[PDB]
Amino acid sequence: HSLLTEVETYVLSIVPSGPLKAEIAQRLEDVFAGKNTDLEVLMEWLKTRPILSPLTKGILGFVFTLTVPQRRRFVQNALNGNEDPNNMDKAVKLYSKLKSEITFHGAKEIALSYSAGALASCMGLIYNRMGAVTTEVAFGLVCATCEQIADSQHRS
Amino acid sequence: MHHHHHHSLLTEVETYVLSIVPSGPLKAEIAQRLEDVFAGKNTDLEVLMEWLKTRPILSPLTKGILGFVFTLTVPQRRRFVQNALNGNEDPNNMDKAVKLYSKLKSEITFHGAKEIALSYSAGALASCMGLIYNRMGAVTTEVAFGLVCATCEQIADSQ
């Protein structure tokens, strides 16, 4: 699907360049192509990768948890970060909005108004309330969060 | 550190919880469960939680509070508890719930914590519990108790 391939592109955009990036991709694709499952061994593999910042692991964990038909703590930790107020004050308002969105694009457009921090905080909390938004909308958020992070790594 | 709570505090907490449960034999059962779990009668959470989930009479909200408490004192996280506490997710209950959530991370006394929590509505508090429920390590156990009691007081007051 164009959508899944688009998401994966956004997701992949934050992983550092290397062989892992191509491995992480293959996984994302098998998961997308409807192949196997056992998110367990997947999250296990995912939580033991050397080079991936914790935030990258959280987002990947979120994505896999979202695409693979259980609330691992390393996913919750990395996403919530320092639970810095405001980040949490925004993610809550972003969250209340996303509950009303239905399209991947309506969702990504709004989520891109918020900072990387509040976004990760918004993902981290929807990770506990996964049925609060649709999969597409959730995707919109993920993508928006990867562009905000990619742009943060840019301002160097 | 250590996980010893004074039997006075536990009975304090126990009377607040019990304040929202309707009289009847069920309430007497809950008291038993709550007390011998306060004493630490080698209790199993999954059992308790399952029992708690399948109980009649009890409103969802009361099941969430009791569920929060048991998890708090006994050594997976349920769902009926999250829905119960979270419930409605009013975009304001959550606003306040997050602000309270951050203040309690710097609190250390059941009293100090229960003192602040009361400055909030039964709704925000319930959402705050819902938050800590997925982050029981954010605040200490006694502080968590303060929130529970302040929450039980607020609803027993709206009643």
Q: Does A76 touch chain B (CB under 8 A)?
A: yes
Cα–Cα distance, B74 to B9 (Å, whole number): 16
Domains and CATH numbers, chain B: 1-80 (1.20.91.10), 81-158 (1.10.10.180)
- In order, the DSSP letters of B28-58 are HHHHHHHHHHHTT----HHHHHHHHHT-SS-
- Number of Cβ within a 10 Å radius of residue A8: 20
Indicate the residue of B86, B91, B134 with minimum beta-carbon distance to A96.
Answer: B91
| B5 vs B118: CA distance, rounded Å | 22
The answer to whether B99 contacts A83, with C-beta atoms less than 8 Å apart, is: no
Inter-residue contact A89 to A121 (CB < 8 Å): no
Q: Minimal CA–CA distance to A6: which of A32, A27, A24? A: A32
CA distance A140 to A105: 6
Q: Please work out, in degrees rounded to the nearest 5, the angle formed at the alpha carbon of residue A72 by the alpha carbons of B125 and B63.
A: 35
Where helices occur in A51-155 by DSSP H, the ranges are 54-67, 73-80, 87-98, 104-111, 116-126, 135-154
The verdict on a CB contact (< 8 Å) between A128 and B134 is: yes
Task: Please say whether the beta carbons of A53 and A81 come within 8 A.
Answer: no
What is the Cα–Cα distance from B3 to B134, expressed in whole angstroms? 20
Q: What are phi and psi of B21, to 5 degrees?
A: -80, 135
Task: Specify the residue for token string 């469960």.
Answer: B33
| Residue type at A67 in one-letter notation | T
Instruction: Collect all residues of chain B within an 8 Å Cβ-Cβ radius of residue A132.
Output: 89
User: Where do breaks (C to N over 2.5 Å) occur in chain A, by preceding residue number?
Assistant: 69
Give the number of other Cβ atoms within 10 Å of residue B2's Cβ: 4
> Measured between alpha carbons, how far is A6 from A19 in angstroms, rounded to an integer?
20
Tokens of B4: 């010893």
Contact between residue A147 and residue A112 where contact means Cβ atoms under 8 Å apart: yes
Breaks in chain B (C to N > 2.5 A) come right after: 75
Q: Which residue of A has its CA nearest to B133?
A: A128
Contact: B98, A76; criterion CB under 8 Å: no
Under 8 Å between Cβ of A55 and A120: yes
Q: Which amino acid is at B1?
A: M
Six-digit token string for B96 = 């306040």
CB contact under 8 A, B95 and A83: no
In terms of residues, how long is chain A?
Answer: 156
Count CB atoms within 10 A of the CB of residue A34: 9
Using CB atoms, pick whichever of B77, B86, B98 lies closest to residue A89.
Answer: B98
Distance CA(B46)–CA(B74), nearest Å, equals 10
Question: Which pair of structure tokens corresponds to residue B107?
Answer: 């609190």
Neighboring chain A residues of B83 at a CB cutoff of 8 Å: none
